Design a protein around this ligand. Structure first.
Ligand SMILES: COc1ccc(-c2cn(C)c(=O)c3cc(C(=O)N4CCN(S(C)(=O)=O)CC4)sc23)cc1OC
Length: 101
């Protein structure tokens, strides 16, 4: 595994620590979130990000950060502001970008 893979694995570990319930661990299913796939055109989650690192699909830190932001933006689009998912998405978006510097 390459230097970028090693760095991204480090960032991903640190980001996932901010989601102890694992709300962002796996793709959101329509069973858990009614109509999700018909509202969110480009789903993303931490599990998919892990698989993309292992497959060496991220060629820059910029691309990784864009998937992280996509994940958070999707949650802030689908969920109303008063939900646990919206609130956590906003919190980890800002904290995660600060952590990655
Ligand atoms: C199995 O554990 C979980 C895994 C995923 C979700 C989940 C993740 N994310 C990121 C979501 O955006 C999300 C939305 C959920 C949902 O069904 N909602 C929240 C938003 N409202 S809304 C549109 O009325 O604001 C509809 C119901 S479940 C879920 C929730 C889980 O249980 C606590």
């Amino acid at each position: 595994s390459t230097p970028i893979q090693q760095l991204l694995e480090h960032f991903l570990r640190q980001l996932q620590r901010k989601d102890p319930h694992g709300f962002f661990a796996f793709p959101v299913t329509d069973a858990i979130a009614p109509g999700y796939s018909m509202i969110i055109k480009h789903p993303m989650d931490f599990g998919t990000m892990k698989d993309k690192i292992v497959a060496n699909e991220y060629k820059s830190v910029t691309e990784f950060k864009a998937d992280f932001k996509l994940m958070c933006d999707n949650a802030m689009t689908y969920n109303r502001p008063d939900t646990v998912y919206y609130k956590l998405a906003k919190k980890i978006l800002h904290a995660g970008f600060k952590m990655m510097s």
